[PDB]
Design a protein around this ligand. Structure first.
Ligand SMILES: [F-]
Ligand SMILES: [F-]
Ligand SMILES: [Mg+2]
Ligand SMILES: [Mg+2]
Lengths: 436, 436
């Protein structure tokens, strides 16, 4: 029995405030802190800021805290809802809000009672969260699939100050044979990288980005892709490590052309490329590099470039800004075949239930699902248990640097070690981990 | 009753492995992850690496894990030691090691059973850790003193790739009237800073350092001090925020002269300054800036420059590398009056007990005590409770960025909120917080 829903403000990996919700049942205090991304696409549920320029650069969340303390809080103690009933929690919460983009109470306000309540059911069925999440989503359990961590080693978009356009160059130790091994390879590739970067580029090029990546002032893709290769060789893990891209293309989408130097700035549109020309750029890149995943190649609504691109892909296409963890918009991408992967962001939709629902819909259509963090993360380790919970096999939780990142990976070590023989690493089957 | 001491390897804020110890009593599993610094002075207890170039760049800690699992582990279940008995735990642990710099079992191996056992006593006396720590150290309790967080906003030493020599430029919101307020000011000064830096210096100068600080390629001190001022004005908190320095002078200590460009490199010794000349440098700096704390002005053994400097100080002098959290060496600094502040690093000495002892000895001599983190931190939030526990009033836990930092600050918000009227912020009495 839920006795007291409370919320307080706390800090996120980037120093901005966010919402922490403490749920108290007869079994203890369950907590959950809320992520915050900042690159984001249009169709994402709404995170409500204070807008008060005089406090926390007006990014405060004083209100959203209030939505929880004086509004949601009381309704709930009293609604005497059964926390095992994720759907019933979410549902009360959606209705409370009565809006479609959680703009009434603000998604930051809700996500939080959601997650928190999932931990309180866990404590109650007396099982680890991963198992809870396993139940909620009706996912196999024999083995659990520890995922290939897609580690963002060099950052170049909203994520870091530098001239680099594509936003994320991720390494994937899919060749590894256990989670602890993959994590060991990546750290290695990672460390090698810090060095080739501080060498070719300058002591300063070794400074990180928002997701703990290196932020060399590279310009073109090739230059950074070549940089990852070199450290992949340096490290001695050649063939065991694959690359992944996050073009975050919504961002240099203009006048119907994509600007690779959305910062030149006397950028020659004589250069701005059309959908089909970027289509060739990427093929060029794809044949020359151990590239297996490409996230948001085209902008959040350029459906034509996706479907076209997608048909001759031969690799995993991930929808971030195109589908914003919305069944609504997923439906469109399936129908239109804009892709085959769903980057899942809990805070993009606001409730546990709608997200689990985002994943089912994706799985029934043959898509894979990479569970993600945000540029602005907290010490909360929930994605760790949800990635295992959903049995997808791919998680984007950043570089092996900056602890709002490691807290997730360190959590994954603990699950693996815990499960024993009852867990298998997706490995080369990252893509179809669910039903593996 | 202690039933099973286990250890596993996990990752630190910088991606290197470290030791995680799980202690299990009849009340649950207590955990603790071990910090790791990397700048460090000579006289620090020993952190034992694997030395195996082929795994984790040979920074693995496969052994140290083994010291705990097959050696310390068994002795302990059986020694049936009363975890309320910190001293008895530590003591068994020291003796097990039989060495003076914990070089036999490695300090990373021990710290860990120590901390972990302190959390298991807490769970057992049925009180929050801060209160436990309060007991262990016989410290007042009516009010508790939340400390002024010394936030490292611009980094320039081992901590970050750039030309800057002094290692840390810290802001201190000592004017604030509560912990949550100080934390709010600093975030503000901080954010303002990210901007003046990306402006004057370049998108790249906005990338952080090891402690989440900004790493502009500044050269001189003045330039960076002026940069903090500007954001202090920008932010609108003028007079409410003080500056703190970490010269980390052991590092550019050479031929008996200090090299401000320990990277020039055709550095003119015609420039290398003697103890008394740096003495003037700092006065220059001190009269021109809201400087209240200076950590390691002189190298770890240049006792003469400390005592000399110290006499005309008029401000707080902090011993990091000079005293390496060692009563032994503190004794020397008191006698010799090399200072009046003790940067306390639990991992520098290896046991909870010797650290608490480091603090008493410091307090009895009139010194203050700033509790510190390390360049390589974890999601563990123990320093948070020890800073409150010892009632010192000053903590160095990094910038409001990168969650291995925020996990401590976010923890401090929770204590304040928790204690109610039973807590007071050291404020302007940072220095003598203990007996306030
Ligand atoms: F993303
Ligand atoms: F330090
Ligand atoms: Mg993305
Ligand atoms: Mg220091």
């Amino acid at each position: 029995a839920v006795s007291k829903v409370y919320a307080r403000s706390v800090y996120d990996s980037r120093g901005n405030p966010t919402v922490e919700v403490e749920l108290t049942t007869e079994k203890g205090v369950f907590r959950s802190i809320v992520p915050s991304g900042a690159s984001t696409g249009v169709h994402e549920a709404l995170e409500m800021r204070d807008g008060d320029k005089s406090k926390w650069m007006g990014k405060g969340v004083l209100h959203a805290v209030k939505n929880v303390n004086d509004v949601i809080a009381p309704a709930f103690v009293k609604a005497n809802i059964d926390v095992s009933d994720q759907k019933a929690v979410d549902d009360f919460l959606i209705s409370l809000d009565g809006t479609a983009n959680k703009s009434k109470l603000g998604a930051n306000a809700i996500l939080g009672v959601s997650l928190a309540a999932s931990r309180a059911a866990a404590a109650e069925k007396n099982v680890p969260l991963y198992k809870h999440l396993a139940d909620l989503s009706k996912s196999k359990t024999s083995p659990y699939v520890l995922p290939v961590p897609f580690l963002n080693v060099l950052n170049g978009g909203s994520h870091a100050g530098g001239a680099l356009a594509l936003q994320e160059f991720m390494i994937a130790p899919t060749g590894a044979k256990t989670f602890a091994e993959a994590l060991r390879i990546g750290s290695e590739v990672y460390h090698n990288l810090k060095s080739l970067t501080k060498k070719r580029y300058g002591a300063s090029a070794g400074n990180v980005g928002d997701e703990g990546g290196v932020a060399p002032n590279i310009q073109t893709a090739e230059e950074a892709l070549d940089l990852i290769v070199d450290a992949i060789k340096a490290a001695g893990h050649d063939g065991k490590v694959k690359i992944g891209l996050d073009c975050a293309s919504s961002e240099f989408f203009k006048d119907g052309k994509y600007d690779l130097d959305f910062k030149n700035p006397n950028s020659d549109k004589s250069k701005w490329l059309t959908g089909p020309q970027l289509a060739d750029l990427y093929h060029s890149l794809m044949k020359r590099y151990p590239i297996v995943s490409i996230e948001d190649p085209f902008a959040e609504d350029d459906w034509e470039a996706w479907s076209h691109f997608f048909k001759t892909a031969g690799i995993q296409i991930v929808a971030d800004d195109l589908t914003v963890t919305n069944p609504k918009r997923i439906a469109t991408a399936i129908e239109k075949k804009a892709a085959d992967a769903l980057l899942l962001k809990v805070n993009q939709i606001g409730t546990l239930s709608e997200s689990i629902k985002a994943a089912q819909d994706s799985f029934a259509a043959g898509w894979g699902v990479m569970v993600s963090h945000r540029s602005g993360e907290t010490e909360d380790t929930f994605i760790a248990d949800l990635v295992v919970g959903l049995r997808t096999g791919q998680i984007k939780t950043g570089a092996p640097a900056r602890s709002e990142r490691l807290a997730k990976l360190n959590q994954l070590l603990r699950i693996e070690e815990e499960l024993g023989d009852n867990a298998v690493f997706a490995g080369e089957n990252f893509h179809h981990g669910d039903k593996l």
